[PDB]
Amino acid sequence: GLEPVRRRPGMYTDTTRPNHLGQEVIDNSVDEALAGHAKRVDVILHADQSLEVIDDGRGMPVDIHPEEGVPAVELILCRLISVVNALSKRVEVNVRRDGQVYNIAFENGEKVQDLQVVGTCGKRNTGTSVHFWPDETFFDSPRFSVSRLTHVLKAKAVLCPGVEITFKDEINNTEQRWCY
């Protein structure tokens, strides 16, 4: 369950700010890049202080695996990036795989929208988007530190030469691009 994360968030993340939540989502995108599948990772800091991370990798698995009765993506989000889900007022996950666009959404660590096919796309159009709204009640400050995000993303870009990383800050109206 995710209740224990909500009871003691500081046992699971840096509760100073939601930056570490951001890093966890970023790490998963970067992993797809390191695995050789993603060529671009975009991060967007929205005006409402929610963070959105998108990669053009293979897309999180949406199928139901033998043994499991629930879509892989749901397990990934709910089975203890599940910490991000636990500590967010809302999380929206969208996946492009197999020429279909899939959506699923959570609030307060609980699913509020079943995995649903909501569109179609090119066969080569693949990737994962995670957009989350941290619950301010778990953090000393709800504000993402922009400098900390930039240090992190510069660090990831150098770790993955050839992968493009972008950061769009819709609060301060800047965009940065790295590609080493």
Annotated binding residues, as ranges? Answer: 28, 55, 81
For the record, the structure tokens of 89 come out as 């007022």
| In the complex, minimum distance from the CB of residue 27 to ligand 1EU, in angstroms, rounded to a whole number | 8
116, containing H or E segment: strand 110-120
Which residue lies nearer to ligand 1EU by CB, 42 or 135? 42
Three-point CA angle 99, 45, 72, nearest 5°: 40
Which residue lies nearer to ligand 1EU by CB, 7 or 67? 67
Interface residues toward ligand 1EU, by CB under 6 A: 25, 28-29, 32, 53, 55, 57-58, 60-61, 76, 128-130
**Residue 144 backbone dihedrals phi, psi, to 5 degrees:** -70, 135
106, containing H or E segment: strand 100-107
For the record, the structure tokens of 158 come out as 């150098």
Annotated binding-site positions for ATP: 28, 55, 81
| In the complex, minimum distance from the CB of residue 40 to ligand 1EU, in angstroms, rounded to a whole number | 12
Which residue lies nearer to ligand 1EU by CB, 5 or 43? 43
Q: What is residue 92's three-state secondary structure?
A: strand
Which residue lies nearer to ligand 1EU by CB, 61 or 142? 61
